[PDB]
Amino acid sequence: AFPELLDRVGGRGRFQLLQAVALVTPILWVTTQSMLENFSAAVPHHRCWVPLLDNSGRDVLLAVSIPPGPDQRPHQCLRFRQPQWQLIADTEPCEDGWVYDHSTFRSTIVTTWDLVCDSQALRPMAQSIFLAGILVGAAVCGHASDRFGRRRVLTWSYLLVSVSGTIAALMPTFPLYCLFRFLVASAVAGVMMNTASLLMEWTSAQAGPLMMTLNALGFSFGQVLTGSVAYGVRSWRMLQLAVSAPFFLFFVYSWWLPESARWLITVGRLDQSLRELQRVAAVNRRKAEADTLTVEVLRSAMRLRTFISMLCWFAFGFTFFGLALDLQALGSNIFLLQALIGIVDLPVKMGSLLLLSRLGRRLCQASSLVLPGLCILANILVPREMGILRSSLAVLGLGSLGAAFTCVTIFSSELFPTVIRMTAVGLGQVAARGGAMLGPLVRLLGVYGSWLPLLVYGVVPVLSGLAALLLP
């Protein structure tokens, strides 16, 4: 009977726009704190420290000091014991530390804590820890919004994000940085889930398309904001502080947003719900039917397809979050990538959905997975002679892959008895945030050929899309 009360008090109107913008704005920085593991932990070119060079023909000393490496570059993990002046066998690893290339990045975490050479596996583990934090935070926060309300949890998660992000930029050792990033990720997941729920509840029966489109648009613009901010600040200690500073002001101004009315009814807090409904009525300027709200009215108010959807969600999350955090090795000009993903995401998603919806829902679902799979797979075949083709295909593939997040949510998830769609979207998202755990760990397979990670990241979505055609 709550929709009757909502229609009595409003619907569309003015408040549902102000609240919408005030909740969409943090999504950009939420995206920023997730893809920030791309300009902070960036690996520049590194070499062994030499006593002859860098104080106690420069090319001649470079040749006589470091043995040549395989990839037409000086070796990054070995050094001559003595200057081999025979050059106009016995090699030994560094102890004096490495020297880095300070031309684009002033200081990275790899620069700070020397996560190179033997200690290489640690870098693709920070993102796995972050995704574990997101998964745990999303799992725990589910049974947290039924006892503590829904508006309070949002404010406390904003404060937690701000405090943990600020503190993490002041740690002197790696494990504490990983722990604070874990906390940041959990709080961010809580923020995202609560924002989605609060957007869903307060609006009318038209909640489906508009708000779920606005959330995706917020993520897409958050990508561009990440790119811009990264272009702005270059140091890594000054990047985390600059990114996490706004969240305190967000916690400050989110202290006045009306709490969800539907939840207050189910718990018996009738007086607060009545006051909240009256204030939204005053804001919406529909102070005509609010008289009928006289408390007594509210007192009286008080298996194949699941497998396929789970597989699609797992493939999307796995490949996307295992391939969207390594744009450094995918091309060049890292600031133009990660800032062209959303610009190639929104138009492609509107156009592809518009052109494909008419042909069929299953056709659109399958076509949104095999196409990016081949798009990614064709990247390894083309040579490095042309870089524009080396970069365009991957960008297009990632943009099309991002369209699956919308295609398998709004047009899909109806593959069920059709009672209500919120019983399956959460279960599908369980895999997504569980599969991205098993993501960047694939990049640990850089040894034993470098084409294997890309081959896997291309094969998995292709197989998922091909199997999606086997619904009957």
Ligand SMILES: O=c1[nH]c(=O)c2[nH]c(=O)[nH]c2[nH]1
């Ligand atoms: O691969 C993803 N996993 C998620 O858990 C998630 N959440 C979100 O908003 N976008 C995505 N993408």
